[PDB]
Amino acid sequence: GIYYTPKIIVDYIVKKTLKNHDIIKNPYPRILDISCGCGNFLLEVYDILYDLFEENIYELKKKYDENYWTVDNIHRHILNYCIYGADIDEKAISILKDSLTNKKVDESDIKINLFCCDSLKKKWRYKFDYIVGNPPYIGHKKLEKKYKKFLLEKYSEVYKDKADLYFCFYKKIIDILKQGGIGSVITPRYFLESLSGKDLREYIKSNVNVQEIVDFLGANIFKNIGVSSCILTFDKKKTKETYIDVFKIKNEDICINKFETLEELLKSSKFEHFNINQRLLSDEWILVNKDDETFYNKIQEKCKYSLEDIAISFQGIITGCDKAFILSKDDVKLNLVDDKFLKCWIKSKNINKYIVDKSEYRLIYSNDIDNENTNKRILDEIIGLYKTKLENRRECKSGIRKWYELQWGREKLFFERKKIMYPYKSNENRFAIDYDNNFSSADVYSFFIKEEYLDKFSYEYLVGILNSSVYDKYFKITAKKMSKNIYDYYPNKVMKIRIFRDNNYEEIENLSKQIISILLNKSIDKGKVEKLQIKMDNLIMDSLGI
DNA sequence: TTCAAAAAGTCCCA
DNA sequence: ATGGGACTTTTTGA
Ligand SMILES: OC[C@H]1O[C@@H](n2cnc3c(N[C@@H]4CCc5ccccc54)ncnc32)[C@H](O)[C@@H]1O
Numbered sequence A: 001g002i003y004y005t006p007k008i009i010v011d012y013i014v015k016k017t018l019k020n021h022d023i024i025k026n027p028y029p030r031i032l033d034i035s036c037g038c039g040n041f042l043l044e045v046y047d048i049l050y051d052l053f054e055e056n057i058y059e060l061k062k063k064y065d066e067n068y069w070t071v072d073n074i075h076r077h078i079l080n081y082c083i084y085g086a087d088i089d090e091k092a093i094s095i096l097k098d099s100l101t102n103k104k105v106d107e108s109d110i111k112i113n114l115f116c117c118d119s120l121k122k123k124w125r126y127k128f129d130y131i132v133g134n135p136p137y138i139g140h141k142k143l144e145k146k147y148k149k150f151l152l153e154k155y156s157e158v159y160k161d162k163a164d165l166y167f168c169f170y171k172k173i174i175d176i177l178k179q180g181g182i183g184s185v186i187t188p189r190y191f192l193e194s195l196s197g198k199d200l201r202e203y204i205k206s207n208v209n210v211q212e213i214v215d216f217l218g219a220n221i222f223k224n225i226g227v228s229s230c231i232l233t234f235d236k237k238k239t240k241e242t243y244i245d246v247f248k249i250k251n252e253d254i255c256i257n258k259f260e261t262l263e264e265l266l267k268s269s270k271f272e273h274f275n276i277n278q279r280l281l282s283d284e285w286i287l288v289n290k291d292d293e294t295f296y297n298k299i300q301e302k303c304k305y306s307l308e309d310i311a312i313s314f315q316g317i318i319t320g321c322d323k324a325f326i327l328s329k330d331d332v333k334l335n336l337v338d339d340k341f342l343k344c345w346i347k348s349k350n351i352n353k354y355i356v357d358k359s360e361y362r363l364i365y366s367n368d369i370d371n372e373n374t375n376k377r378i379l380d381e382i383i384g385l386y387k388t389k390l391e392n393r394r395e396c397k398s399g400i401r402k403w404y405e406l407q408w409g410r411e412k413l414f415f416e417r418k419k420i421m422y423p424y425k426s427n428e429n430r431f432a433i434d435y436d437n438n439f440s441s442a443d444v445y446s447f448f449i450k451e452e453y454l455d456k457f458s459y460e461y462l463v464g465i466l467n468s469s470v471y472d473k474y475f476k477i478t479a480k481k482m483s484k485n486i487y488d489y490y491p492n493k494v495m496k497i498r499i500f501r502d503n504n505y506e507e508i509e510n511l512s513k514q515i516i517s518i519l520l521n522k523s524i525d526k527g528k529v530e531k532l533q534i535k536m537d538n539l540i541m542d543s544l545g546i
Numbered sequence B: 001t002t003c004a005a006a007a008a009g010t011c012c013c014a
Numbered sequence C: 001a002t003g004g005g006a007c008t009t010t011t012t013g014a
């Protein structure tokens, strides 16, 4: 339940909020960690504060109560007035209390402002100058359902649907940050692009000035943790310019301890820096350099259609228990299943550019099983081996589905037709024409072209441009970066891809057909495909004027 | 009735 | 062991 932030990042975040604090003008800064754990951030805040007071102790002594400002009194003053922390874990607070106490070697006891509580429910009696830390990340599946009711009712401005718990910590931190205060936190990066984070992005943009965003993309910041990180620094200062510094990593393979400090890494060639006008952020935050922005805007202005305009999108089958319904095509159990019940089944790894690998699995479309007495053998010997787990699906407990039915079987006729399929998570654009009525789970998305757009766009033309290097770069500008070399390819962004028709349509389509013809050969010469792709990329770059 | 989003991913190996 | 790569289920709110 407790996660250790790397020391190099903790030091950076504390320095970010405190390095320019005028301790002479305000010797009572309130610094808060809203989920402080064992005190990774707060113990470093202590050290930074102690040097700050000690370096200026005589100036404080002269300006203020000279009996109060002595070096021997710095420890007590820091704990009474400056350091605040809250965490749900009682043991961690106890350890942090000891660590703060042991900063100096009984006299009258010193009150330490540490609270064991739910920070999202605490009645905070005052605002804070500086707020730092690493909040909990809990998504919609791992969050207890009784708690979501409170979040949906009290944090509705940032928390709906598939939002994350750390959205609410952003809201709490902002709300209790003083005027002129500064906050700096490390959270997942996904809210920067995700559909769920739209409301949170709106809340940040209109309530604070975002000073800086450090985007680590798919780098592994937390050892043995499958998460992708970013650092946000923001303030409530009266400013006029409100430009954001964006530091975006260039190589996801770096080990974070390259230098003694993080700011050395940010200035190095391992990162790129650029500025974004906060006032120009739409509901989407497009955080790219001027070359990429110029590139993105050209494509948007040139393309008159989007995929959503011309296509019908849908998510794949969700059986609710794949082991009950999915069998290898050579499994002897399939002799028990009438072939009218069997569908070809593919995984995301089966989707290549332009074409799908031949399927090795079969789906039992159990929705078409009329009743339990007529296909008893299928139920008793195949599906019923998982009857307990099948019965625990939500729609079976409510009686909407029979225990042997697919949870979300969708419409068969959507799959049993010519269509385009693509993996839900990939390192690159992989859009394939499906000729074989393939079904799939939710790791593969599909679409088909609307009837009224068939005479403007063909499937062969679409996989041509969509698989091109231009469109690979174009999609990744705004795509959701998930983990190292993985982007989400979900309809909420894939269907926003814009497309064009011009004089190059026929040659692009013809090149795509040549590629498809070679790829479907037995003795395929993969080499010529790459040359045809290079030729097609040139046509597309000519078409879009890049 | 029934859509689609969600990585403190998950699991394996050298 | 740890770090790094291949690959991706079904729960869930709306
Ligand atoms: O993971 C980083 C650190 O965050 C701490 N942490 C976790 N959840 C909280 C929290 N409220 C949450 C909101 C949802 C909920 C439900 C039940 C109980 C608590 C809470 N408030 C303060 N600290 C909290 C952990 O202990 C860890 O050291």
Ligand SMILES: [K+]
Pocket (backbone or CB within 6 Å): A061, A062, A063, A064, A065, A066
């Ligand atoms: K004085």
Ligand SMILES: [K+]
Pocket (backbone or CB within 6 Å): A217, A218, A219, A220, A221, A226, A227, A228, A229, A482, A483, A484
């Ligand atoms: K990562």
